[PDB]
PDB file of C-alpha atoms and ligand atoms in Angstrom:
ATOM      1  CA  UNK A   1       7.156  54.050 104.277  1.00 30.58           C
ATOM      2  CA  UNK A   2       4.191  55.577 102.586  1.00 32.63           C
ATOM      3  CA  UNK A   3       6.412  58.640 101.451  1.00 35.20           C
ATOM      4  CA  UNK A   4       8.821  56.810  99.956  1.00 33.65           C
ATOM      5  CA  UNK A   5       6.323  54.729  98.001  1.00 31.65           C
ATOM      6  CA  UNK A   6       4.566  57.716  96.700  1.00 31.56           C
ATOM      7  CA  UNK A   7       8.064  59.113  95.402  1.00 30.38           C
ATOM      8  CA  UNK A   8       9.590  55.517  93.897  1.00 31.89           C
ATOM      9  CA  UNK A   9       5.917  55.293  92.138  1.00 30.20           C
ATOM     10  CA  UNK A  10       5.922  58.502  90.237  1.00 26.71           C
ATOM     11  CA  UNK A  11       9.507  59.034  89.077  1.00 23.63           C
ATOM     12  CA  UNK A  12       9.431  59.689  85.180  1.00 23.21           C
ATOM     13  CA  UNK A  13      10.209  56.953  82.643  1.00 21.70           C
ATOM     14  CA  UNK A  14      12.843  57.545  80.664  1.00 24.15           C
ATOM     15  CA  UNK A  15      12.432  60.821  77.589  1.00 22.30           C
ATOM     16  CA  UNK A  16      13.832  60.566  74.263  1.00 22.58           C
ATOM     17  CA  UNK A  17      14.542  63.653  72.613  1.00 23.53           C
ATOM     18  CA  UNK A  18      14.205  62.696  68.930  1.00 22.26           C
ATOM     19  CA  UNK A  19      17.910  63.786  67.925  1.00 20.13           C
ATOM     20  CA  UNK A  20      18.596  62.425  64.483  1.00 18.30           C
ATOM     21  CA  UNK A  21      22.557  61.680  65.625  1.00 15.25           C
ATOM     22  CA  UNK A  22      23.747  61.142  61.653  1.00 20.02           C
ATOM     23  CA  UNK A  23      23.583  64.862  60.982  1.00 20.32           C
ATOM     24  CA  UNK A  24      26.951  66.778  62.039  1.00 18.87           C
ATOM     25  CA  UNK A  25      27.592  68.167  65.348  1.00 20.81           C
ATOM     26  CA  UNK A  26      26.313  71.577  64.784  1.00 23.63           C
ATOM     27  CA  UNK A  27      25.438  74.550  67.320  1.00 28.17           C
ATOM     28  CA  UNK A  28      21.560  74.634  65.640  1.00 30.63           C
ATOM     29  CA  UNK A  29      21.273  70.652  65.574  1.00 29.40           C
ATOM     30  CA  UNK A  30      22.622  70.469  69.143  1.00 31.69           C
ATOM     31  CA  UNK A  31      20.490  73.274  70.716  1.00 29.88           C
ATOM     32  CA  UNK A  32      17.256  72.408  68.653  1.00 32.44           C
ATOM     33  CA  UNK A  33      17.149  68.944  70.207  1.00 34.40           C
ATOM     34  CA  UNK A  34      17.750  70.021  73.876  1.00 31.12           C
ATOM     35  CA  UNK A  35      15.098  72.685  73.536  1.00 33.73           C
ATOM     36  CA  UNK A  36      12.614  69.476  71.926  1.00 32.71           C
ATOM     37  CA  UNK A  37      14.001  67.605  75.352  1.00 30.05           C
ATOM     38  CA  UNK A  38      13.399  70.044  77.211  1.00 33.16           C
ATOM     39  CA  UNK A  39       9.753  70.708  75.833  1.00 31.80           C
ATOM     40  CA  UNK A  40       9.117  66.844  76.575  1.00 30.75           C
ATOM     41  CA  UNK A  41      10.751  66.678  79.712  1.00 34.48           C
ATOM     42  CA  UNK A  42       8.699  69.779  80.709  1.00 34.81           C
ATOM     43  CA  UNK A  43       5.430  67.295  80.054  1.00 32.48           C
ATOM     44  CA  UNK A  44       6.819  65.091  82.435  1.00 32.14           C
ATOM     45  CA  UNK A  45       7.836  67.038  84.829  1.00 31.24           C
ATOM     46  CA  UNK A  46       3.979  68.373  85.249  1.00 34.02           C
ATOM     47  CA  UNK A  47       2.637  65.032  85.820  1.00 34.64           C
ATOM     48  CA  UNK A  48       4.987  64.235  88.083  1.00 35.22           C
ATOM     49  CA  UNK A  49       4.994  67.182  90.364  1.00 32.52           C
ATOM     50  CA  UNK A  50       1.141  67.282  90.233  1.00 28.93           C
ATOM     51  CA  UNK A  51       1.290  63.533  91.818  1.00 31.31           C
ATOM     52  CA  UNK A  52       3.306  64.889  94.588  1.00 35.74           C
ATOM     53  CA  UNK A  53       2.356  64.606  98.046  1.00 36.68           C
ATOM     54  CA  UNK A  54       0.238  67.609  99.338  1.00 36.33           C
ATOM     55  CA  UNK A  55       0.683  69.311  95.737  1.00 35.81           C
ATOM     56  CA  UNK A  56      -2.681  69.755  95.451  1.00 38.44           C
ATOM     57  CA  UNK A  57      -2.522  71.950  99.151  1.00 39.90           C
ATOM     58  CA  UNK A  58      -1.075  74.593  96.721  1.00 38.85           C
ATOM     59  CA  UNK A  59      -3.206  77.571  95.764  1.00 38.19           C
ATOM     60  CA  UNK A  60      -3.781  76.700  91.635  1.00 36.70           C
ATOM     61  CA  UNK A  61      -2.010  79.425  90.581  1.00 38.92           C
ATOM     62  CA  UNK A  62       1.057  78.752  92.398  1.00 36.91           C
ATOM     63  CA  UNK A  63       1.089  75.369  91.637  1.00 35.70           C
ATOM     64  CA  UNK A  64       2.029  76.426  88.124  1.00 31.38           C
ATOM     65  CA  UNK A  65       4.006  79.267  89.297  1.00 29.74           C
ATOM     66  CA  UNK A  66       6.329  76.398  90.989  1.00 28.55           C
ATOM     67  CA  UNK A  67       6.892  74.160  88.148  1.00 28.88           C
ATOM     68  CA  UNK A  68       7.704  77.021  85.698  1.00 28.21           C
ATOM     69  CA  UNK A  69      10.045  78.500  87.810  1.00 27.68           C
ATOM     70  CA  UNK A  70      11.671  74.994  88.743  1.00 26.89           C
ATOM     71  CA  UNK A  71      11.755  73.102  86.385  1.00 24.59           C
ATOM     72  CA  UNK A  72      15.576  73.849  85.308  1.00 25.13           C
ATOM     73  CA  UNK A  73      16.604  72.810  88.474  1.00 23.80           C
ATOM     74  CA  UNK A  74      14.930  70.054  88.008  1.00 24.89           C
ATOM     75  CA  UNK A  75      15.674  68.551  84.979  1.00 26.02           C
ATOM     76  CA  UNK A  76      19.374  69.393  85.281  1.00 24.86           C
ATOM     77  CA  UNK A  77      19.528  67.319  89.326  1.00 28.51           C
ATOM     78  CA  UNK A  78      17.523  64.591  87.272  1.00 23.95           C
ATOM     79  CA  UNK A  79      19.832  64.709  84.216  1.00 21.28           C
ATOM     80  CA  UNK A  80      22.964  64.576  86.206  1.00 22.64           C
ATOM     81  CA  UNK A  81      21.432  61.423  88.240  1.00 22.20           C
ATOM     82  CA  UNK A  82      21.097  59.736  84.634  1.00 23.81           C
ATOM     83  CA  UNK A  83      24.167  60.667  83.972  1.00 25.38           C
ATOM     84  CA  UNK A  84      25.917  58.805  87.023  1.00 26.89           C
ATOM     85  CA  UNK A  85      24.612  55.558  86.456  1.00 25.88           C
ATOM     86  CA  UNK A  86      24.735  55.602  82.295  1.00 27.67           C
ATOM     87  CA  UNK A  87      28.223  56.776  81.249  1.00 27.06           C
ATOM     88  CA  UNK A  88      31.359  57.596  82.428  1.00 26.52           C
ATOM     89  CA  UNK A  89      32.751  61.231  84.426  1.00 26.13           C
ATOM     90  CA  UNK A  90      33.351  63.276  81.009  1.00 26.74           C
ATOM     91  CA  UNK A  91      29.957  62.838  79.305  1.00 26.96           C
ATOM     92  CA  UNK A  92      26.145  64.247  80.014  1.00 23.25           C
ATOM     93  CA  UNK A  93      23.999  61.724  79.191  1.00 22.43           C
ATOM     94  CA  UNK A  94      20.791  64.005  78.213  1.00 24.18           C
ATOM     95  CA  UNK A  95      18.213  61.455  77.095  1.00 25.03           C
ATOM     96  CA  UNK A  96      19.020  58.016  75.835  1.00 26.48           C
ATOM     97  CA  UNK A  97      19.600  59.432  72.346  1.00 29.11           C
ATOM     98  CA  UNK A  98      21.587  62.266  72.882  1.00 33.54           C
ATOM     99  CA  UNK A  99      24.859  61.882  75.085  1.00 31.56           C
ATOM    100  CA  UNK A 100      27.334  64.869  75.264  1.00 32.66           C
ATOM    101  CA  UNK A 101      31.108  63.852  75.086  1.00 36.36           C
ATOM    102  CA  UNK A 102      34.033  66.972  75.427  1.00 36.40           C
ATOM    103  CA  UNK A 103      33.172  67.483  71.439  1.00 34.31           C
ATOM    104  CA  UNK A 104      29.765  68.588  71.996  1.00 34.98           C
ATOM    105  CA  UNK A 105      30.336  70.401  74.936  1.00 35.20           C
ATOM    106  CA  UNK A 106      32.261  72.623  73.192  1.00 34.48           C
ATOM    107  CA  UNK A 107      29.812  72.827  69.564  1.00 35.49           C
ATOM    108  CA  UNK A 108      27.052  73.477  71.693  1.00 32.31           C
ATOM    109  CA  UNK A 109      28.640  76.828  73.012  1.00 30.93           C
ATOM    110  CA  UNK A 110      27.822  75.602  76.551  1.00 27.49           C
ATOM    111  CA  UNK A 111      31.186  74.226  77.607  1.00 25.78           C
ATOM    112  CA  UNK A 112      31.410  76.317  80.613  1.00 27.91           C
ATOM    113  CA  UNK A 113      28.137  75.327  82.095  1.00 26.94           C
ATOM    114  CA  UNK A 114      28.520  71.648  81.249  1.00 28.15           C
ATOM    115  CA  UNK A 115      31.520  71.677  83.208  1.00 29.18           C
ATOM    116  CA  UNK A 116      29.097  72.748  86.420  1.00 29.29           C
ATOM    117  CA  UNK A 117      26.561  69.816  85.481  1.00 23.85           C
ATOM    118  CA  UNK A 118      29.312  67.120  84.991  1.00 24.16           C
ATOM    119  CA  UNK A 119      30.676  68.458  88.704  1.00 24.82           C
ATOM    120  CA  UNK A 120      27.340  68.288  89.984  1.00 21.71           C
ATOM    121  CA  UNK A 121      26.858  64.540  88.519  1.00 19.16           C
ATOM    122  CA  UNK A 122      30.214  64.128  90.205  1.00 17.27           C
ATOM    123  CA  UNK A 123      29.229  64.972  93.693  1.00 16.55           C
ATOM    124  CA  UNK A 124      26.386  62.380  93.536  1.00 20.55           C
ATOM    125  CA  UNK A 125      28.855  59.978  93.422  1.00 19.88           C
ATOM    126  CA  UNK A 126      31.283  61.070  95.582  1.00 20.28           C
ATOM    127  CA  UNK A 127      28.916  61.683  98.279  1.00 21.71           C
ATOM    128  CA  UNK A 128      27.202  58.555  97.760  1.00 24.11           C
ATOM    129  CA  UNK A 129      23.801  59.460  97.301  1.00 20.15           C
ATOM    130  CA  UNK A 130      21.127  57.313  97.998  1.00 18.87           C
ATOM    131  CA  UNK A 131      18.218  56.608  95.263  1.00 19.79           C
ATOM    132  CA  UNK A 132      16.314  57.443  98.123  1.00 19.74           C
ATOM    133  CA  UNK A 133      17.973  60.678  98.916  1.00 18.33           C
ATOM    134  CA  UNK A 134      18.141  61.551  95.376  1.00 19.29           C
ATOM    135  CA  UNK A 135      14.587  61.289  95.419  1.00 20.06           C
ATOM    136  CA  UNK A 136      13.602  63.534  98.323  1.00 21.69           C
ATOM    137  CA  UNK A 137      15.998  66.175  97.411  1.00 21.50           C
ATOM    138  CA  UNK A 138      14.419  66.038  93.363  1.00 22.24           C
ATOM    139  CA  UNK A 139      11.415  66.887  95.617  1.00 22.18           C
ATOM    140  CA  UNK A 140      12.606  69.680  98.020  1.00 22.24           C
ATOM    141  CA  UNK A 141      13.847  71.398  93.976  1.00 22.65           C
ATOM    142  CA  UNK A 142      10.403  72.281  93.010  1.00 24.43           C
ATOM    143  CA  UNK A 143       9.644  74.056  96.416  1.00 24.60           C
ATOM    144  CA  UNK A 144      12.880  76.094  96.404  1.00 21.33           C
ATOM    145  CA  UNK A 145      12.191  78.951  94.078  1.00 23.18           C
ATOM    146  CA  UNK A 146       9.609  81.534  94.893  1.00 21.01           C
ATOM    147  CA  UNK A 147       8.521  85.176  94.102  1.00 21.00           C
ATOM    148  CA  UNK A 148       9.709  87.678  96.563  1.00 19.72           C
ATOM    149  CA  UNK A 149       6.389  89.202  96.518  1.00 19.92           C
ATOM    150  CA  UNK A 150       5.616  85.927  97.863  1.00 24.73           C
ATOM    151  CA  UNK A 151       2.836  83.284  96.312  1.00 22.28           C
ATOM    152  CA  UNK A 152      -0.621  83.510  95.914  1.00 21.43           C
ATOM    153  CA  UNK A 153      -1.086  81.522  99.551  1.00 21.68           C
ATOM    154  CA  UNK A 154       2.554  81.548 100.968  1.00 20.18           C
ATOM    155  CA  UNK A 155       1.366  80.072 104.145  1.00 19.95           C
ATOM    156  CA  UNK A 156       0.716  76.586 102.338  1.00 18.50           C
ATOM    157  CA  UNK A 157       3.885  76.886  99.927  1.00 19.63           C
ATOM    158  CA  UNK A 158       5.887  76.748 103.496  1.00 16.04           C
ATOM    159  CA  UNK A 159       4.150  74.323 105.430  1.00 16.20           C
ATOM    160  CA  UNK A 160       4.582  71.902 102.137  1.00 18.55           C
ATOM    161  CA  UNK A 161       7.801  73.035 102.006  1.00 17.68           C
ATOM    162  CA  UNK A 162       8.678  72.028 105.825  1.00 16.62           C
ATOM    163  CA  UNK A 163       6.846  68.970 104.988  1.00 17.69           C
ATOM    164  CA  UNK A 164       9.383  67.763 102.373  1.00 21.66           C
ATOM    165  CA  UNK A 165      12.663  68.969 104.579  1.00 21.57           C
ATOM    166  CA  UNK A 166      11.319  66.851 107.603  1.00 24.84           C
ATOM    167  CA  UNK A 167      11.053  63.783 104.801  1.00 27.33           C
ATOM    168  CA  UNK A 168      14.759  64.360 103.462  1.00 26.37           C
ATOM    169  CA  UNK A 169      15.841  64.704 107.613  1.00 28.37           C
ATOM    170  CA  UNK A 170      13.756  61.148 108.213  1.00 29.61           C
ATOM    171  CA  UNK A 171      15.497  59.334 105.166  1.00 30.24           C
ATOM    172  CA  UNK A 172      18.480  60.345 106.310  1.00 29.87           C
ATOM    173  CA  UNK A 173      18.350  59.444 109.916  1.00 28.66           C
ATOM    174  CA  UNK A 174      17.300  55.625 109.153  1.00 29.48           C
ATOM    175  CA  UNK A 175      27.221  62.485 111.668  1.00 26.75           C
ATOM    176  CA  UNK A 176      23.360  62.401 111.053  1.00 28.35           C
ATOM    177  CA  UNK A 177      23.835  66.063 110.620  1.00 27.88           C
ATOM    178  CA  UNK A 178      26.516  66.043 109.002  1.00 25.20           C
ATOM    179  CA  UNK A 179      24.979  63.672 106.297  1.00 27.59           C
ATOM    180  CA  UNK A 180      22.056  66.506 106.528  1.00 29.21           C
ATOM    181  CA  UNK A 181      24.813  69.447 106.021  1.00 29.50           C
ATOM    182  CA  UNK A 182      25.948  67.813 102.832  1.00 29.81           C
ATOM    183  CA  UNK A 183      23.037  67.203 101.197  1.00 31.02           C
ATOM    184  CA  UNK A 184      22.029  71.154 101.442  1.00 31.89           C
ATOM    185  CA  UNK A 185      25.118  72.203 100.422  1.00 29.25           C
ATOM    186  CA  UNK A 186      24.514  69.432  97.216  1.00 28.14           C
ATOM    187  CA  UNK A 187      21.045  71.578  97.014  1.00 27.39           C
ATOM    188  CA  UNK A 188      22.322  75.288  97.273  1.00 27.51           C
ATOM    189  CA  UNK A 189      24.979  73.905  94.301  1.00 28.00           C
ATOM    190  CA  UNK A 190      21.843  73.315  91.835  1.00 27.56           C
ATOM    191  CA  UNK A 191      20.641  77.365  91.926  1.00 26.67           C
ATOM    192  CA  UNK A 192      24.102  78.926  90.522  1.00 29.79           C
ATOM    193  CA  UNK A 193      24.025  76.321  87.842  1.00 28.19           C
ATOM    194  CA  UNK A 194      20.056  76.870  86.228  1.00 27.76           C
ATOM    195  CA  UNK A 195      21.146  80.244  87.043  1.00 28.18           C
ATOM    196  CA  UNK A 196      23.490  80.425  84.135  1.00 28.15           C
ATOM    197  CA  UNK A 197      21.503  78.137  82.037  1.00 31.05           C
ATOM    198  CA  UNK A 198      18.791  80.361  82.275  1.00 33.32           C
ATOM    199  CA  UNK A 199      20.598  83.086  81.185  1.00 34.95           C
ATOM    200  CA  UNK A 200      22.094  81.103  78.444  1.00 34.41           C
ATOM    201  CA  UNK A 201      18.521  80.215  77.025  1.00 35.69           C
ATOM    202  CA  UNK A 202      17.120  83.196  77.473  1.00 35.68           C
ATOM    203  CA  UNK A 203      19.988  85.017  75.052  1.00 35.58           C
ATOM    204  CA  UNK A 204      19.480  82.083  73.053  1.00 34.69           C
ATOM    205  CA  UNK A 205      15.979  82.422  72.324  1.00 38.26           C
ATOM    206  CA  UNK A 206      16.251  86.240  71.812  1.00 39.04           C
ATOM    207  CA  UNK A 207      19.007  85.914  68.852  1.00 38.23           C
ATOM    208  CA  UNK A 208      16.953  82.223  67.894  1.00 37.50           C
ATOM    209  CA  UNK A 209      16.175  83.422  64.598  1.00 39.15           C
ATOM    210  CA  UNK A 210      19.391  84.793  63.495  1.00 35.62           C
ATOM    211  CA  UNK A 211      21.427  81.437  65.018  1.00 35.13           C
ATOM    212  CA  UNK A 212      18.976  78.900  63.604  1.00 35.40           C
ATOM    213  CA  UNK A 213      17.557  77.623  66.465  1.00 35.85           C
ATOM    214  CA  UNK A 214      14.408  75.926  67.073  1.00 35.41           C
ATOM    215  CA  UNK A 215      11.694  76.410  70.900  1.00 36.99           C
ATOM    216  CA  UNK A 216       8.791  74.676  70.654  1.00 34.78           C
ATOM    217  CA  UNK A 217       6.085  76.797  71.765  1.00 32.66           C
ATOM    218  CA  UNK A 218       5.619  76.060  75.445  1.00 32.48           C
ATOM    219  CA  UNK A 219       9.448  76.252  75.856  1.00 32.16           C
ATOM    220  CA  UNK A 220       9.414  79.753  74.016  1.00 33.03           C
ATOM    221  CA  UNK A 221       6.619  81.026  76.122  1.00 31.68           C
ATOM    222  CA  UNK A 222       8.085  80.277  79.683  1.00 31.87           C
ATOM    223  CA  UNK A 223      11.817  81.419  78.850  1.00 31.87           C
ATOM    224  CA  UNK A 224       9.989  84.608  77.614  1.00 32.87           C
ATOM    225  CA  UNK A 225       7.767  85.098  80.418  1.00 32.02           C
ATOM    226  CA  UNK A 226       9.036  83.393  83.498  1.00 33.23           C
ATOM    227  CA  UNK A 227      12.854  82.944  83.085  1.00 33.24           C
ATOM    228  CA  UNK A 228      13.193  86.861  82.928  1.00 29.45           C
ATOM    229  CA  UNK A 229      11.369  87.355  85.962  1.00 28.10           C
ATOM    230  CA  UNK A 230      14.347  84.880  87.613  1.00 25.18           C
ATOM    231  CA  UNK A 231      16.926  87.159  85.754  1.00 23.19           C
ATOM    232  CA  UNK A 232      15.525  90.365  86.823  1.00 22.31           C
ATOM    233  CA  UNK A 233      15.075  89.256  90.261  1.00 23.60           C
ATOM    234  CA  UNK A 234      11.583  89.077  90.831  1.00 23.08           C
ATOM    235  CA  UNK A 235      12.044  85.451  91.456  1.00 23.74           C
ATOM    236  CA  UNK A 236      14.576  84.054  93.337  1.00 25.67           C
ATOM    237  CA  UNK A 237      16.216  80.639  95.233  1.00 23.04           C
ATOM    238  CA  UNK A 238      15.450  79.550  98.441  1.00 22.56           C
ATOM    239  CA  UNK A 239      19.022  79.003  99.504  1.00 19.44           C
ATOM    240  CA  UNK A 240      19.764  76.643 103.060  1.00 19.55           C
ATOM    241  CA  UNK A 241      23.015  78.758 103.582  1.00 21.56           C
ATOM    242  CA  UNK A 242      23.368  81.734 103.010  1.00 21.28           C
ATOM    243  CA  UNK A 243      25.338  82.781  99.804  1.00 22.68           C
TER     244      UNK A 243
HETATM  245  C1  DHT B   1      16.669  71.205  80.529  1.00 24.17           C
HETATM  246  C2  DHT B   1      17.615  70.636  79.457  1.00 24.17           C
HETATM  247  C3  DHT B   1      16.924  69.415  78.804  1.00 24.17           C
HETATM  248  C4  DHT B   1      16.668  68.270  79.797  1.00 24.17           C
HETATM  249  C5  DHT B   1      17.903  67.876  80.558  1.00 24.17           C
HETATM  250  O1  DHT B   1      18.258  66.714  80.660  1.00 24.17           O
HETATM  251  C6  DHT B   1      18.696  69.007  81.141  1.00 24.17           C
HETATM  252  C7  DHT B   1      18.925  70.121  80.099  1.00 24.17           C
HETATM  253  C8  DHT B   1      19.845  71.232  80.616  1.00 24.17           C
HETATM  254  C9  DHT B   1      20.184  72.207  79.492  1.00 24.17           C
HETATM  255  C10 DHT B   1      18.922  72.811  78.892  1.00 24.17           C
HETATM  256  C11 DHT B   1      17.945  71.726  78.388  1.00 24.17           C
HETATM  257  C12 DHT B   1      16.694  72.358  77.758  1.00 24.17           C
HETATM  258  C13 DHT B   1      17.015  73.401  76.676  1.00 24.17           C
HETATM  259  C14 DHT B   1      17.995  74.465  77.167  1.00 24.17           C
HETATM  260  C15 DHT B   1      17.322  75.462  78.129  1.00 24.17           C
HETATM  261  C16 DHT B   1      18.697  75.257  76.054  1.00 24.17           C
HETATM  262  O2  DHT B   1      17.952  76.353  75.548  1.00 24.17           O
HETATM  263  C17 DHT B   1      20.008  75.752  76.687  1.00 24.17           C
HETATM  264  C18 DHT B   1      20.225  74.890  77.949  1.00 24.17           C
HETATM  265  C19 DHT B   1      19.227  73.749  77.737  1.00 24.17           C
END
């Protein structure tokens, strides 16, 4: 089980995001500390993919095309898997240090949305996902967003790609399919969801200054370069069924 091993190995230790929780609930302190989570995570989330098997098959430049695109998906699939095992059906549990209950939800303007990821966190229960399954899937999340133009070599993006559904089809197997039908429709559920958080940080960092809120700088540079390139539709999800 040498793919298994590979994925168990590299799965990222647990991120604080340095939320001094004796300030009050505001909108600026709230959003400020995802956006320094989400800068850390983002470190993580390199290593990680870079220690993936065949990663290195990808053309240089489209390795980093991958993880900037994906890495929303990412985080949030990862988050909500945190979130299963460390509190209870009404709360995100974001890092160790900063857990949202229905109050936050609501300060941090982002209600809506954390509905989706608490649903989402939901369905990995009620399907009974497997850390095993959970794992191949995280996988299969940074290989599911791609320019239409295509990538620098698109020929190795989808024989990596096939790679990793053949390894989520192999875990599963050990009704098979039907297992296999659920786990892509668990999959397709992820894109609608860093779909609107996308949008939502990318208003967010346009009005930043006038709302108070803090992106560190390689979290300011990707939702200004890459995130609008998802929003205007130059990049786009790699969906099993169709939509
Ligand atoms: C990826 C993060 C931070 C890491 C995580 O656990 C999931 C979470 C989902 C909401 C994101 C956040 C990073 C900062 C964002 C993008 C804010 O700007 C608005 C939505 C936030």
């Amino acid at each position: 089980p040498i793919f298994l091993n590979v994925l168990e190995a590299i799965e990222p230790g647990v991120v604080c995001a340095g939320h001094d929780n004796n300030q009050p609930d505001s909108f600026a302190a709230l959003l400020s500390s995802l956006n320094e989570l989400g800068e850390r995570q983002l470190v993580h989330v390199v290593k990680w993919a870079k220690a993936l098997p065949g990663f290195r098959n990808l053309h240089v430049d489209d390795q980093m095309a991958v993880i900037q695109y994906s890495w929303m998906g990412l985080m949030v699939f990862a988050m909500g898997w945190r979130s299963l095992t460390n509190v209870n059906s009404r709360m995100l549990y974001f890092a160790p240090d900063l857990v949202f209950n229905e109050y936050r939800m609501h300060k941090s303007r982002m209600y809506s949305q954390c509905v989706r990821m608490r649903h989402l966190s939901q369905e990995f229960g009620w399907l009974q996902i497997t850390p095993q399954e959970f794992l191949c899937m995280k996988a299969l999340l940074l290989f599911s967003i791609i320019p239409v133009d295509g990538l620098k070599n698109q020929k190795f993006f989808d024989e990596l790609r096939m790679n990793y559904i053949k390894e989520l089809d192999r875990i599963i197997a050990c009704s098979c399919s039907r297992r296999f039908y659920q786990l892509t429709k668990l999959l397709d559920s992820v894109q609608p969801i860093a779909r609107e958080l996308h949008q939502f940080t990318f208003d967010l960092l346009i009005k930043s200054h006038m709302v108070s809120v803090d992106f560190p700088e390689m979290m300011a540079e990707i939702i200004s370069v890459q995130v609008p390139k998802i929003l205007s539709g130059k990049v786009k999800p790699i969906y099993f069924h169709t939509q």
